[PDB]
Amino acid sequence: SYEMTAELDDLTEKIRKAHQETFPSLCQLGKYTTNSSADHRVRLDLGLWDKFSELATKCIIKIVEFAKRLPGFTGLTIADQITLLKAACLDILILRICTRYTPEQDTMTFSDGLTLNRTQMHNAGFGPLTDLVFTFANQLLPLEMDDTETGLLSAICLICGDRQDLEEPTKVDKLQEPLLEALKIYIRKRRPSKPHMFPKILMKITDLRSISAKGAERVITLKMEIPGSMPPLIQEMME
Amino acid sequence: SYEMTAELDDLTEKIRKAHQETFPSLCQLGKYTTNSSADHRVRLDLGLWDKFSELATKCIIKIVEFAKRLPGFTGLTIADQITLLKAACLDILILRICTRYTPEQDTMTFSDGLTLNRTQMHNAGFGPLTDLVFTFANQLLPLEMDDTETGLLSAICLICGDRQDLEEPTKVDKLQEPLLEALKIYIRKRRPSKPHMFPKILMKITDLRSISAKGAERVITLKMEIPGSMPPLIQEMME
Amino acid sequence: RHKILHRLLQE
Amino acid sequence: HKILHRLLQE
Ligand SMILES: O=C(O)c1ccc(NC(=O)c2ccc3cccc(-c4ccccc4)c3c2)cc1
Ligand SMILES: O=C(O)c1ccc(NC(=O)c2ccc3cccc(-c4ccccc4)c3c2)cc1
Numbered sequence: 001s002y003e004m005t006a007e008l009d010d011l012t013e014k015i016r017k018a019h020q021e022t023f024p025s026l027c028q029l030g031k032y033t034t035n036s037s038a039d040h041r042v043r044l045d046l047g048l049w050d051k052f053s054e055l056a057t058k059c060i061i062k063i064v065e066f067a068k069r070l071p072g073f074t075g076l077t078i079a080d081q082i083t084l085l086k087a088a089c090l091d092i093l094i095l096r097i098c099t100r101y102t103p104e105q106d107t108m109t110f111s112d113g114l115t116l117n118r119t120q121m122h123n124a125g126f127g128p129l130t131d132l133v134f135t136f137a138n139q140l141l142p143l144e145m146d147d148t149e150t151g152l153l154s155a156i157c158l159i160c161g162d163r164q165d166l167e168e169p170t171k172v173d174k175l176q177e178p179l180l181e182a183l184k185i186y187i188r189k190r191r192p193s194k195p196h197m198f199p200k201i202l203m204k205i206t207d208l209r210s211i212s213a214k215g216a217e218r219v220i221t222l223k224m225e226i227p228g229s230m231p232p233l234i235q236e237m238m239e
Numbered sequence: 240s241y242e243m244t245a246e247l248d249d250l251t252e253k254i255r256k257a258h259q260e261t262f263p264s265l266c267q268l269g270k271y272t273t274n275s276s277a278d279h280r281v282r283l284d285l286g287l288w289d290k291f292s293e294l295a296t297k298c299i300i301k302i303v304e305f306a307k308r309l310p311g312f313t314g315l316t317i318a319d320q321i322t323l324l325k326a327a328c329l330d331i332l333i334l335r336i337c338t339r340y341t342p343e344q345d346t347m348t349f350s351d352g353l354t355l356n357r358t359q360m361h362n363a364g365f366g367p368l369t370d371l372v373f374t375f376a377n378q379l380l381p382l383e384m385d386d387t388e389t390g391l392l393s394a395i396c397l398i399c400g401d402r403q404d405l406e407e408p409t410k411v412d413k414l415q416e417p418l419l420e421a422l423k424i425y426i427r428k429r430r431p432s433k434p435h436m437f438p439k440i441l442m443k444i445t446d447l448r449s450i451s452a453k454g455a456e457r458v459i460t461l462k463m464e465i466p467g468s469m470p471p472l473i474q475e476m477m478e
Numbered sequence: 479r480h481k482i483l484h485r486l487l488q489e
Numbered sequence: 490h491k492i493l494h495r496l497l498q499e
Contacts, residue, residue: 064496202441203442205442209448213453237493472483
């Protein structure tokens with residue numbers, strides 16, 4: 001029914017703790033809604049945008065923290081740490097907010113409890129990407145991932161040795177390798193029936209990539225609508 | 240004879256064949272070059288575009304015949320068959336051309352034999368996306384994929400249940416599953432040495448979706464730079 | 479309202 | 490980068 005996978009379960013545990021401690025679970029938050037432009041869609045709600053861009057800044061900070069938790073990541077040179085972060089960041093921003101989707105209310109919750117409906121996500125700065133991101137959220141539900149699988153996935157995404165301008169890409173590959181076998185196994189243990197789940201979940205990174213690509217272009221357009229300037233951290237990550 | 244083993248060897252074969260018979264091998268192509276804008280890089284070579292766009296169109300036609308050869312594909316709805324084609328057409332265009340890359344000469348070879356260098360490819364229409372497409376072509380050789388791997392990988396792009404506006408996402412989804420299993424089984428049959436080669440090859444679709452996302456954005460840019468309309472079929476696939 | 483792809487599908 | 494450097498160097 002299984003076997004020993006010792007020093008891979010310990011790694012798996014490191015990833016779950018790293019994730020949970022940097023990303024409060026949905027059920028564990030004090031939700032609160034807002035009244036601002038909840039009725040109809042608009043180009044950009046300066047009010048909603050203000051809080052959103054701040055929660056984005058904060059989530060980025062937690063992401064960097066999650067990275068430094070991943071064994072070996074700090075071992076990579078600063079340049080390669082930055083290269084990896086800058087490439088996967090948006091992919092994970094997407095992943096996180098989507099695991100905060102409430103199917104029935106059709107909303108999303110941030111780490112401060114703030115819970116916006118589809119239309120408010122649009123006005124917060126999602127624009128044309130709204131329906132696309134929300135579609136992805138609904139595609140995740142039927143998989144019923146847990147914090148372990150979500151953390152492992154975000155890790156596989158960040159620790160990718162195919163990024164451009166990377167100095168020790170095989171050092172990165174080596175680090176990613178176990179994260180893959182760790183996931184492969186954990187899914188087999190967490191599920192004794194549906195056996196085609198490793199691939200299905202694994203190539204959801206593929207889905208993230210599409211959205212992250214179209215996402216960067218949204219981020220370019222946004223600077224054309226914004227009162228002043230992009231949060232320095234956001235610009236630093238999107239260059 | 241074990242059942243699923245048998246059925247998957249069947250699927251694997253039909254797809255390999257459907258790939259060989261719809262896409263010639265780089266080794267069985269009689270190459271030939273041209274001197275049009277071959278030395279320096281310009282905004283657009285109307286001459287190269289016309290020929291590139293003609294060969295792409297015929298590849299699309301080729302790609303359509305490939306889909307029709309995929310087990311279950313003509314069992315989907317016509318909206319869905321159409322939808323899947325339009326959403327994976329560019330993914331496969333990229334994949335197909337990137338397996339026709341020659342490292343020593345830094346060139347790519349179409350189906351009629353035409354062989355354009357990196358500069359000519361740009362002048363043909365790749366524009367600012369040129370190097371991105373070539374880099375991906377480099378990161379494909381070390382895998383030395385064959386008709387079967389490239390074929391299954393194309394069928395996975397084509398039979399994707401997460402594509403938007405699908406009438407029967409679940410049917411399309413269950414249809415992708417056997418493919419994912421065949422790829423895993425085959426990849427392991429080929430290289431029982433390198434064991435982690437399944438997720439590596441499989442996740443090349445991550446690159447596809449990113450390049451494809453930017454390709455779509457590029458196509459729109461071409462649409463205003465070309466003194467005429469793109470071929471009718473390309474128009475349709477890019478809607 | 480292109481009519482090519484469908485014709486190709488039909489064969 | 491000013492921020493990433495700091496945040497990373499810790
Ligand atoms: O737990 C939180 O509080 C939290 C979770 C996810 C996020 N996610 C994002 O900020 C995010 C998610 C998806 C996105 C998709 C497309 C574009 C952006 C975006 C990023 C930076 C500036 C503007 C838009 C996106 C930004 C923010 C905060
Ligand atoms: O053997 C053939 O005949 C053949 C193989 C691949 C292709 N590939 C493409 O046409 C192709 C490949 C990559 C692309 C990346 C970005 C944009 C386009 C593109 C597609 C349609 C119109 C303009 C650009 C791309 C188009 C064409 C012909």
